[PDB]
Amino acid sequence: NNYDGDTVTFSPTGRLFQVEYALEAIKQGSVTVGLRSNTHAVLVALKRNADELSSYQKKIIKCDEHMGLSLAGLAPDARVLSNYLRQQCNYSSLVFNRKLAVERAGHLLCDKAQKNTQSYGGRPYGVGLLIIGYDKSGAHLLEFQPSGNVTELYGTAIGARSQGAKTYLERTLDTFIKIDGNPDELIKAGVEAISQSLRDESLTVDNLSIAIVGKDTPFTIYDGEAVAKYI
Amino acid sequence: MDIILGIRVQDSVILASSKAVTRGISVLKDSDDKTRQLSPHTLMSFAGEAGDTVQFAEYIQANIQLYSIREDYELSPQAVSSFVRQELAKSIRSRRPYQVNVLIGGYDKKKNKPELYQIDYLGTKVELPYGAHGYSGFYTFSLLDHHYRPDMTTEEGLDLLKLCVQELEKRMPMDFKGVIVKIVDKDGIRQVDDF
Amino acid sequence: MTDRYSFSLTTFSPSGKLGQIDYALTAVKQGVTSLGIKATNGVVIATEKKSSSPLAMSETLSKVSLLTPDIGAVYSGMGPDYRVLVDKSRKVAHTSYKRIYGEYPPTKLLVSEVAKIMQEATQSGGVRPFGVSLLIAGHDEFNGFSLYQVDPSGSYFPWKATAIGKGSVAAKTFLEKRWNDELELEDAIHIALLTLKESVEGEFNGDTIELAIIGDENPDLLGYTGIPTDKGPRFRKLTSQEINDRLEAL
Amino acid sequence: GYDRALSIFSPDGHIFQVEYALEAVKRGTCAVGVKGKNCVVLGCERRSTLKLQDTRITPSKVSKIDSHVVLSFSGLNADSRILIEKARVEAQSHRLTLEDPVTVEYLTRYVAGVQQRYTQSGGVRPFGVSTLIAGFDPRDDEPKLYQTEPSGIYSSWSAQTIGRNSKTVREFLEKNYDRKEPPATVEECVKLTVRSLLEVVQTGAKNIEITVVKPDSDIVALSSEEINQYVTQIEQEKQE
Amino acid sequence: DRGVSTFSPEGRLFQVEYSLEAIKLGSTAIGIATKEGVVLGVEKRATSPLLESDSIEKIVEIDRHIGCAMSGLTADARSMIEHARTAAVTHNLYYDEDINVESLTQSVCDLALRFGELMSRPFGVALLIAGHDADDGYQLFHAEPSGTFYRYNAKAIGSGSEGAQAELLNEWHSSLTLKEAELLVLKILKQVMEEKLDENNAQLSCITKQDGFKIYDNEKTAELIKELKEKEAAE
Amino acid sequence: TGYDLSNSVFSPDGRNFQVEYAVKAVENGTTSIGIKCNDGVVFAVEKLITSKLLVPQKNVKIQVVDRHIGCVYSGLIPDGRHLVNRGREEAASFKKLYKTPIPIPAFADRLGQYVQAHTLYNSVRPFGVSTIFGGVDKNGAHLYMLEPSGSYWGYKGAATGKGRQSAKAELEKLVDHHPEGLSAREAVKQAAKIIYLAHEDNKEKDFELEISWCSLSETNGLHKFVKGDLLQEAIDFAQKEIN
Amino acid sequence: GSRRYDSRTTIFSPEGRLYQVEYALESISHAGTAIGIMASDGIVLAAERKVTSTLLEQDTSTEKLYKLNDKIAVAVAGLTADAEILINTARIHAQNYLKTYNEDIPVEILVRRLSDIKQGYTQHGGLRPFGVSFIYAGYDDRYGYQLYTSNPSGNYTGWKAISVGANTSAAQTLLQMDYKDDMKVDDAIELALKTLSKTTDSSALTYDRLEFATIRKGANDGEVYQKIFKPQEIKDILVKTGIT
Amino acid sequence: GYDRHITIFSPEGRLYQVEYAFKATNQTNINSLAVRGKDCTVVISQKKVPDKLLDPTTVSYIFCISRTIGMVVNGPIPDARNAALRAKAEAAEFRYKYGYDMPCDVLAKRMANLSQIYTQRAYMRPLGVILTFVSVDEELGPSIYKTDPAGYYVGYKATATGPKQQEITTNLENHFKKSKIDHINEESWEKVVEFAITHMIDALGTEFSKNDLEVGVATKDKFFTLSAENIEERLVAIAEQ
């Protein structure tokens, strides 16, 4: 109200409204799902078009051979944060000959977002990210909020109508965690999860975007006729 | 480059500058004009290290042309020479100094007088009836000391200049491929196309 | 962090007033009275030592300050602002003059430097004006004795005699009746003590009054002998006893 | 440093500081440009509220940027000097590096770029100035006339006016200027320019300035008497 | 007042949303992508008849294989064009090849959100970037001041955009010829323009693999306008 | 009014309202505690299980500084991470110049001055965390708690977050009933109980217990996380006390 | 943050005016009147000190008339402290020019430079403008005797006769009435003092309330002399012209 | 009304942020007292530990700035420690640059100058503290110099600070009106501490245990604080006469 003019101002109840408004931009964004087993980790994303002449906005970005994310919210902010992750993954490989741990990647994203919430002149990031990866401790899934809060999960969803997919994953928890050594079935579970968030529209060939990373699987993105198999 | 001469007579200033450009072993050009018009009644000839000479001359030219447009007025030869001196005095304590020596021949329209200024790369300025840079003075000054009069005509100045060039062509080891001669007077700047 | 106040805090209002300068002058008006009188053979500057508490040692608080051996200063208004201005004035006398010319600045030019500092606090980014008016007395070879007033705006004026602060209006009228161009230094001190008594409520003695002069050279205060041209400072702060002696002939 | 964003968008998609800069131009004295077949004429209004003026030394309204290009303006006089200085420096810089004087379009594009920059840089306000830039490209006999404004947009004009009451003189030019047959001579072009200012000026005395630019760096400013002869001939034809 | 980088309660940047309103006031620009090439067209919209209309430059070359049309505060586009041209040329210098149309577009869009208290405000202009490369063929992109860019088969921006976009919705198909696209841009421009469309107040351009980016002559466009008139009178 | 709109502004009371608003964010956070024992310190924190999809034991909250200091905080988690990152820089520079690992009181002031600095200007926001930290140095065990104002003191026991009142009361009983002191192993058990008891203020969702400790005898003066059997033993002891 | 307290000193009004410039001009209208008159054989500068005191040391006092170099002087109207900042900058510029070209700076070039400095404070930096208007009286060998004025906007103009400060409207009308082109310095001295005597807000015009200066080629032969009048010399010229 | 938020003048020529910083000074509800002996300078301050969970040994508002200089603070602990760290850094730098120990009055002036800057520069707020510096100076002898948020400072024969400063001040005034000397005429510092505690008891009307007080003592070449047991020995001597 009187306390939402900038990110440097607490409200009388201790809230940061500019951060909360940035969180609101994610809720307007298109739905994207993340889930993992013990061998693989999967991203599923519903892409959004402007109209029938337009292309469908890309949602998934590769960060390294073993790591990548999906976005929901301001796309240019995702480009900035993913670029930073690309650099940090790269610094780890060049300097230490070491693949960057997914947990450490989450810590770095948290700290980068935090600085934009405590200083004058700047603004919070207006995007949410779902980071998947396979490192020395197996498969991982992270959820990033521009408040700075990063959380490790078995599965999750962000964007508009993401609550439906999140409840489905909460039911299916015991089933999909056991899908080891079967990439197709894990993606099926993710496609079925994101279907719980659809209304009026359905998953078409240029609508759907899928990414996977695992034990002997580099981070790869599937679009176009490559996802027709799962429709 | 090599030889640049200057002489101030009754009503004009005459500048003579060699045409040769030599890059070590070969003479690459024999028609090089080692001068820049700074303003309608002011001419500057130059000699020194390759590249720096033309770079400095054109830089000065640009600055005087800028002043002329800003004020709608031509600076006096004295004022132009002082500006050039300061630039060279500034340059000598720089990271990489301009290795450039100049003569400035101008006709002052206010005083109705020709003026010749000699400035070396250190920023050493002197006003002279006649001047030179490098070894040119060593061969020519004894002739100029003898024949020079302050009331000489332009034609007499050219004749005395011819005698100087002839002595240079006789006793200098280097072939400087003749000189381009230019006259600065009340009507402006013109080139003597047969010398 | 970083100072993000790069804009002026003093600005013109629709009526053409510079509010912050006017308000700084109001702070000066609330300040304790100080005065200055110029004689033929000297200058005197004086003020009241308004002690905040009787447990406080008011001798440790100097309202009258030496700027150079021949220049002194007194103020009315905010004490802390004065103290830092004295520090800056002492330094600028060296950096912008003595380290260049090998001699102390003339009164008018040191005043000019202090004035410049006060002007800049009226235009520079993220600062308020100084809440003081200064009276600067001094001597130099070619200008003789002089007395100047400097205001929060940076404006300065030379005076034969003047007063600033609390009871300045009444004090200036008192000085107009007594001042002439034939006054000796002792006469000016006498008039200074008379003028200052009117604005003082409580105790009036050497311990509650601070008074200094710009007068003859004091070779006894030089600290060394041997150089004929060096004859000592013209600034001298009067002692508590010296003030009380002149209060009996009052 | 002072970084405050003074030029910003409003809810309706307007940048008010740029729009208010145009209001400063509206207040400025009228300036007009007309191009003939082999010339361009720049006319300028002088407000007669200021007499006891020394006209020898007072800043003239038309400024040479180079020997072949001129610049006139409407708006804040102090602001215009900054643009004129920058334009003159760029003109010499162009000659120094390209070894050819600026084209009229290039010089216009530079000045317009400076104006635009001051509409999205921190801590600065836009120029309260619109300019008319006229001249001839090197070794070219085709007349050139361009206009710039505070936003930084620029364009070419057969004839144009800026400043106070420019709506009126543009009205005149739109019905009197024929594109198929522009003022064939210097006389005809100056006459049409003086006529256009007489719609707005008041007295045809020391209130009208005229500068003629011809090809090959031929620029001359007309005197009071020369302009007065145009003023005389125009009204004697009007008495009919 | 309030920050230039402030979020609204809905999660949108105030300044970005306001710049989008400035673009709505701009003159119309249309692009249509085909398998034979991409066509770009604009409304010139001269403010007066004395303004020489061929000096209005709202279609611009970025490289031989990339063109660009603008709508909104067109002065703001100049630094964007300069950056685009520099990026295209620089990539050729570093890699001895043409730059991808998408990569060029992405580079332009990186400038967009570089504002705060960098430039003091967002750009008040939208761009249609059209071009061809070997990997993805003929392409058309819409670059906004939000930093977002969408690829389009066909797109209209400016004051007549939503009416034009509805028209492009019906008319575009994957088998359009270059000639058919040219007439289609002219037809839709004529529909949304205030003044009557002719060769002086409208401008066409195209990008083909063979000939590269070309702005059409007024004589060439005049013939296409006459061809349009006759085929509309044909039924 | 308007005094609460900008940081570093004194109200007519002499209060910095922005700092007081930062405290509200702390009070909204989960419960964290610290217990000073005979030869060391124990830290414990409540982790709310928002969903079944959270991977157990993965989202670690307690942080180590150097090798002998533990830090836990309640409020805005990112703000706490920023403070610990600074603390790690401070500890590194101290050890670089002076060789010895940073003493706990010395480390306390480094965090204190940094947090206080974020109350001096309107261009920055105060920290939205209260931090409980400490460890073992050459003079023995030390426990500290640091507030958004930059204020800190030494403690026998400390608590912050939503269930701080409940926790404080439990800590006060331990101080009274053990004037001679508490063992490190006892302190771990007691820490588990107190978090379980403090969870009544957050009873809607279930939680995960996380404990760490530094002890001269039990961990050689190094900070370690309580894991496996010792953690389960503490959970069992805690569950027995609430029933 | 800090934005809250920013007055924004460099913005246009809806009418296209610069707030701070306009308000600075309002400030200057309350300053003591300064007049400059240009004649064929010299220039006169006359100015009124603001309500003085009998205890002010006049002979060592300077608030109105300042020397920029041997050929150029200024009359000040506005904040004296602001004026001294600009005056020192102008003195330096004159010396920079003299060092560079070995010729005295032409009057207009100095005036343009100071005016450009004033302009900058209205367009960038977020600082308040200088509350000062200058009258420049000077001589060079190009245009001869010249009078200029500049104000806080950074705009400058040339004049035959001009006033700044208080009552300029009344002063300018009186000057416009009695000024002629073939006028001489001694006549201009009389006009300036007569104009101040009629426009003043004081009861009577006396020597202690005035500062006076002339720039004459009344220097022996082909040179120019500046004369800052002493208190006794102002008293004499007041008697000569028949005002006291 | 933004003249109340930053340190610019109000229409009355006042600085409200400075005035409000003086009010923050009494937020701790603690009173301090300082007196001078023949050979020493003593400072006492109330100690309040309201929470049983606190470690009472870490609760302190007296600071050892240098070997010779002590400082007691009236105001919140964050600002107190800010001032303490800076004073320590300034004192150490002074010794390094000028080759002798920084005098108490010179440090006071330096900190007062820093405070003055916060009253003139807008981006910096005043510190809500009053700083009382004590020492036995090698030139001036026993010294008390006190600084406030306005940037004011002065020397004192004796002084008091806190919510009930007036009661203590008047009590001290009345004693020095009797004795007619500028100090406590006593040989040992122990008896000067006893004087200080006795007169605080009289002025406040409250009794003190060993944990209710905090004492700092300055002698030639060192400043030190007393332990609870040292204070207890002081309290016993007071009660036995």
Q: Note whether F24 contacts A13, CB cutoff 8 Å.
A: yes
The Cα–Cα gap between E69 and E219 comes to: 20
Under the phi-then-psi rule, with left for phi > 0, alpha for psi from -120 to 50, and beta for the rest, what region is C123? alpha
Distance CA E192, CA G184 (A): 72
Chain mean position to CA A83 = 14
Residues D133 and D97: beta-carbon distance below 8 Å: no
Q: Residue B72 phi/psi, 5° resolution?
A: 50, 50
Q: Is C189 exposed, middle or buried (0-12, 13-18, 19+ CB in 10 A)?
A: buried
CB contact under 8 A, E153 and A54: yes
Task: Look up tokens 């006396």; give the residue.
Answer: G206
Quick one: tokens of A214? 């695992």
Tokens coding F104? 């706990």
Give how far A217 is from chain F: nearest CA, Å.
23
d(CA C174, CA F202) in angstroms, rounded, equals 78
Which of A8, A110, A141 is the best residue to mutate to test the F interface, defined by the most F CB atoms within 10 Å of its own CB?
A8
- DSSP label at H107? H
Three-state SS string over chain D comes to CCCCCCCCECCCCCEHHHHHHHHHHHHCCCEEEEECCCCEEEEEECCCCCCCECCCCCCCCCEECCCCEEEEEEECHHHHHHHHHHHHHHHHHHHHHHCCCCCHHHHHHHHHHHHHHCCCCCCECCCCEEEEEEECCCCCCCCEEEEECCCCCEEEECEEEECCCHHHHHHHHHHHCCCCCCCCCHHHHHHHHHHHHHCCCCCCCCCEEEEEEECCCEEEECCHHHHHHHHHHHHHHHCC
Chain B contact partners (≥3 CB pairs within 8 A): D, G
Domains plus CATH for chain H?
1-241 (3.60.20.10)
Walk me through the domains of chain B, giving residue ranges and CATH numbers. 1-195 (3.60.20.10)
- Name the amino acid, one letter, at H222: K
**E positions 93-122 inside 8 Å of G (CB):** 117
Chain C neighbours among D 99-128 (CB < 8 Å)?
123
Q: Which of E5, E6, E8, E18 best probes binding to D when mutated, by most D CB atoms within 10 angstroms?
A: E18
In the 8-state DSSP scheme, what is residue G172?
H
Is it the case that chain G and chain F have 3 or more CB pairs lying under 8 Å apart? Answer: yes
Looking at chain G, which residue has its C-alpha nearest residue F5?
G1
Task: Check: CB of residue H143 under 8 Å from CB of residue H134.
Answer: yes
Report CB contact under 8 Å: F123, A103.
Answer: no
Resolution of the coordinates, Å: 2.5
Return d(Cα H143, Cα H157) in angstroms, integer: 8
Q: Which residues pair with B106 in a beta bridge?
A: B42, B115
Tally C–G CB contacts below 8 A: 114
Long-range contacts of D17-21 (CB under 8 A, 24+ apart): D17/D119, D17/D125, D17/D126, D17/G11, D17/G12, D18/D119, D18/D126, D18/D150, D18/D151, D20/G11, D20/G12, D20/G13, D20/G14, D20/G15, D20/G16, D21/D75, D21/D125, D21/D126, D21/D127, D21/D128, D21/D129, D21/D150, D21/G12, D21/G16
Spatial CB neighbours of A190, under 8 Å, sequence gap ≥ 6: A33, A34, A35, A42, A43, A44, A210
Classified by CATH at the fold level, domain G1-244 comes out as Glutamine Phosphoribosylpyrophosphate, subunit 1, domain 1 (3.60.20)
CATH superfamily of this structure's domain A1-231: Aminohydrolase, N-terminal nucleophile (Ntn) domain (3.60.20.10)
Q: Does G4 reach chain H within 8 Å, measured CB to CB? A: yes
Q: Which residues pair with A70 in a beta bridge?
A: A60, A130
3-state secondary structure of C123: coil
CATH of the domain at C86: 3.60.20.10
CA angle D172, D177, D179 (to 5 degrees): 150
Tally of CA atoms within 13 A in the half-sphere of D85 that contains its CB: 10
Q: Do A12 and F21 touch (CB under 8 A)?
A: yes
Task: Tell me how far the alpha carbon of residue F47 is from its chain's centroid.
Answer: 13
DSSP letter at G82 equals: H
Tokens 């200089």 locate to H69
Give the DSSP H/E element, type plus range, for residue A73: strand A67-73
Interface residue of A55, A81, A119, A206 to substitute, partner E, most E CBs within 10 Å: A55
Q: Give φ, ψ of D186 to 5 degrees.
A: -65, -45
Interface test with G, best of D29, D49, D50, D54 (most G CBs within 10 A): D54
Which chains border H (3 or more CB–CB pairs < 8 Å)? C, F, G
For residue A49, the chain E residues in CB contact (below 8 A) are: 150
Radius of gyration of chain H (CA): 18
Q: Which residues contact B20 (CB under 8 A, 6 or more apart)?
A: B1, B2, B27, B29, B30, B32, B174, B175, B176, B177
**By a Cβ cutoff of 8 Å, what residues of chain D touch chain G?**
2, 4, 6, 16-17, 20-27, 50-59, 76-79, 81-82, 118, 123-125, 127-128
Q: Does E96 touch chain D (CB under 8 A)?
A: no
Report the alpha-carbon distance of residue D69 to residue F206 in Å, rounded: 81
CB contact under 8 A, D2 and G126: yes
Which residues does chain B have within 8 Å of residue G140's beta carbon, measured at their own beta carbons?
Answer: none
Helices and strands (H, E) in chain E, number of each type: 6, 10
- For chain D, the maximum distance between any two Cα atoms, rounded to a whole number of angstroms, is 65
B65 close contact with D: CB closer than 8 A: yes
Residue E19 touches chain D, beta carbons under 8 Å: yes
Q: Which of C24, C55, C84 sits opposite H13 (nearest CB)?
A: C24
**Cβ distance of B71 and G141 shorter than 8 Å:** no
* Residue D232 one-letter amino acid: T
Cβ-Cβ contacts under 8 Å, H159 against chain C: 53, 55-56
- Active site (annotated) includes residue F30: yes
* Catalytic hit among F1, F30, F31, F119: F30
H127's tokens: 């510190």
C-beta atoms of F3 and H24 within 8 A? no
Q: How many CA atoms lie within 13 A of E149 on its CB side?
A: 26
CATH at E46: 3.60.20.10
Give the nearest partner residue to G100 out of B71, B86, B110, using CB atoms.
Answer: B86
Q: Chain C: list its partners (3+ Cβ pairs within 8 Å).
A: D, F, G, H
How many distinct structural domains can be found in chain C? 1
- Partner-chain contact C12 G56, CB within 8 Å: no
G8 touches chain B (CB under 8 A): no
Residues of D in contact with E118 (CB under 8 A): 122
* Residue among H230, H218, H237, H191 at smallest CA distance from H135: H218
B66 touches chain D (CB under 8 A): yes
Question: D186-198 vs D166-176: helix axis angle to the nearest 10?
Answer: 140
Beta partners for D40? D35, D213
CA–CA distance, F175 with C70 (Å, rounded to integer): 70
State the CB neighbour count (10 A cutoff) for residue B188.
Answer: 14
Q: Measured between beta carbons, which residues in chain D are less than 8 angstroms from residue C7? A: 2, 4
Which experiment gave this structure?
X-ray
What fold characterizes domain F1-243? Glutamine Phosphoribosylpyrophosphate, subunit 1, domain 1 (3.60.20)
As a whole number of angstroms, the distance between CA C88 and CA C95 comes to: 10
Give the residue from G29, G57, G64 with the most C CB atoms within 10 Å of its CB, the best one to mutate: G57
H241-to-E178, F16, F46, H235 alpha-carbon distances in Å = 114, 47, 57, 11
Question: Could you say which DSSP state residue C125 is in?
Answer: B
Residues B45, B5: Cα–Cα separation, whole Å = 9
Q: E50 near D157, Cβ under 8 Å?
A: yes
Q: Which residues of G touch D2 (CB under 8 A)?
A: 124-127
**Residue among A128, A137, A127 nearest A66 (CA):** A137
Domain ranges, residue E131 = 1-235
Please give the distance of CA H155 from its chain centroid, rounded to a whole number.
12
Residue whose entry in the numeric block shows the structure tokens 């902010």: A77
Query: Domain range holding D65?
Result: 1-240
